[PDB]
Amino acid sequence: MTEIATTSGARSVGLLSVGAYRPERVVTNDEICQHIDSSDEWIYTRTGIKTRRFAADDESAASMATEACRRALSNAGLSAADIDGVIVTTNTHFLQTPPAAPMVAASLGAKGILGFDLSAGAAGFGYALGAAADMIRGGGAATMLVVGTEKLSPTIDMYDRGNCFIFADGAAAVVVGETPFQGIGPTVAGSDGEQADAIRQDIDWITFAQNPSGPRPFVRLEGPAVFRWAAFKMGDVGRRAMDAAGVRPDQIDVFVPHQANSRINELLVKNLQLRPDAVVANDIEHTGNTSAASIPLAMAELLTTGAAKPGDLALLIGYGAGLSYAAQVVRMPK
């Protein structure tokens, strides 16, 4: 008889670049406060958000992903031909099928490359990044695109005084490939499925399709439940990720938690025992909560301002719907 072959690729993998796409339209707190009894002062104090970007009607999660990938490729000095696969992570691709990944690949001029869509709420980026790293190390690919993208705005109920000022749109991609030294730490992930209702679409699409003249679905957020969970549990997740990467808290240069709420993230900083001079992502102020796109958007922001430098040691922690979390230590890209 015979034995199935065992193969592998390059074990040392890193981020070669990040590229970001932020839709043109700025929406201020004042504009949001047209339909709720609140204020700019209240929203900012409670969430850290001042403005956010909304995509145009002719844009989609897929279209924004493609643009982010184009920019990541340019920032890496690479072309579509250099990519072996693409993982699209999103929760706002509004078709059951086909998946966005093949269309994104085709738009980039690499229609034939492997790829799929990964959905895990905000934790989607960490899972997709870990999955790309795993695939590359295993020899299934040499270089990959991982893109987080969300068009959340069409799912927002603008009268919902719990979340209409939270969610927003955008996309950001990383090129993942072989590096001289290890650039992506082990994935630390998990969930709490018992709190699946905390971030949800309230009416499923089929129930809706069978009663379309009735209420339509919107995203709902049980804010305090998520706040409590994230603020209390993500510190341990961070410690596990640093432990797995073999780094001490005081070695982290840059902290990039999912941009859910500034107060949650501030509490995490105070729990994580980072250096006083550690750089902390605050992209939320002008980006809001872009779920799956949040972390790569925040990474791009930090590099843009120069607050983060290429090579900086970064701790990434994604947390959100499903109650799903995913974290890893990485070295900052270009």
With CA atoms as reference, report the closest residue to 149 among 40, 245, 247, 20: 20
Q: Does 115 bind Cl ion (CB under 5 A)?
A: no
**331 touches 14 (CB < 8 A):** yes
- Side-chain-facing half-sphere of 172: CA atoms under 13 Å: 28
Give CA–CA dist 174/15, Å, rounded: 6
282 binds, among Cl ion, a second copy, none (CB under 5 to 8 A by kind): Cl ion
Can you tell me which residue has the tokens 């924004």? 64
170 binds, among Cl ion, a second copy, none (CB under 5 to 8 A by kind): none
With CA atoms as reference, report the closest residue to 16 among 209, 145, 192: 145
Q: Does 201 bind Cl ion (CB under 5 A)?
A: no
User: For a second copy, which is the closer residue by CB, 10 or 39?
Assistant: 10
290 three-class SS:
coil
Pick from 19, 23, 85, 257: which binds a second copy (CB under 8 A)?
A: 85
H or E element that contains 206: helix 205-209
Pick from 23, 102, 235, 296: which binds a second copy (CB under 8 A)?
A: 102
**88 touches 99 (CB < 8 A):** yes
- Side-chain-facing half-sphere of 230: CA atoms under 13 Å: 34
Site for a second copy, residues 169 to 188, rule: CB under 8 A: 181-187
Pick from 68, 120, 321, 330: which binds Cl ion (CB under 5 A)?
A: 321
67 binds, among Cl ion, a second copy, none (CB under 5 to 8 A by kind): none
271 binds, among a second copy, Cl ion, none (CB under 5 to 8 A by kind): Cl ion
Pick from 33, 38, 50, 116: which binds a second copy (CB under 8 A)?
A: 116
Q: Does 24 bind a second copy (CB under 8 A)?
A: no
End-to-end CA distance of the chain: 49
Q: Does 163 bind a second copy (CB under 8 A)?
A: no
Site for Cl ion, residues 280 to 319, rule: CB under 5 A: 282-283, 291, 301
Phi, psi of 263 (to 5 degrees): -70, -35
Pick from 33, 50, 78, 99: which binds a second copy (CB under 8 A)?
A: 99
Give CA–CA dist 80/151, Å, rounded: 24
Q: Does 234 bind a second copy (CB under 8 A)?
A: no
217 binds, among a second copy, Cl ion, none (CB under 5 to 8 A by kind): a second copy
CA triple 324-135-65, angle to 5 deg: 65
Span interacting with a second copy, options 74-82, 120-128, 272-280, 297-305, rule CB under 8 A: 120-128
232 binds, among Cl ion, a second copy, none (CB under 5 to 8 A by kind): none
Give CA–CA dist 117/329, Å, rounded: 23
Pick from 122, 131, 168, 256: which binds Cl ion (CB under 5 A)?
A: 122
Q: Which residues contact 207 (CB under 8 A, 6 or more apart)?
A: none
Q: Label each residue of 53-76 as H, E or C.
A: EECCCCCCHHHHHHHHHHHHHHHH
Q: Does 6 bind a second copy (CB under 8 A)?
A: yes
Span interacting with a second copy, options 27-35, 72-80, 258-266, 316-324, rule CB under 8 A: 316-324
H or E element that contains 173: strand 169-178
User: For Cl ion, which is the closer residue by CB, 137 or 334?
Assistant: 334
Site for Cl ion, residues 256 to 275, rule: CB under 5 A: 271
Interaction pattern, residues 45-74, with a second copy; x per rule: CB under 8 A: ------------------------------
With CA atoms as reference, report the closest residue to 64 among 297, 325, 321: 297
User: For a second copy, which is the closer residue by CB, 29 or 324?
Assistant: 324
34 binds, among a second copy, Cl ion, none (CB under 5 to 8 A by kind): none
